[PDB]
Amino acid sequence: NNLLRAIEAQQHLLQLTVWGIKQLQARILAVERYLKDQ
Amino acid sequence: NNLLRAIEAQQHLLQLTVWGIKQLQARILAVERYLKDQ
């Protein structure tokens, strides 16, 4: 039961790291485009 | 016991991916600010 609880909490951590990677991919793409456009 | 060992090692991987996401969030924010300031 401790291992099931650990995997459930680890899944929540993975969802948070996916949210953060998608935020950073959109922000670096924005900056790339801004520099290309300049 | 193999599954406990797997979850322990996966937790170490997740900590490494959190370190890397926080490094990249600070570096893209720095670049955003630099461009705003220019």
Binding site: L3, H12, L16 | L4, E8, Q11, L14, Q15
Partner: peptide, 25 residues
């Protein structure tokens, strides 16, 4: 969503502390 980086940090820390206890126990 409403998510901010300060909230993201708090939630990472909360889930990491929990997993540590579950794994030790």
């Amino acid at each position: 969503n409403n998510m901010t980086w300060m909230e993201w940090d708090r939630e990472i820390n909360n889930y990491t502390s929990l997993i540590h206890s579950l794994i030790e126990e």
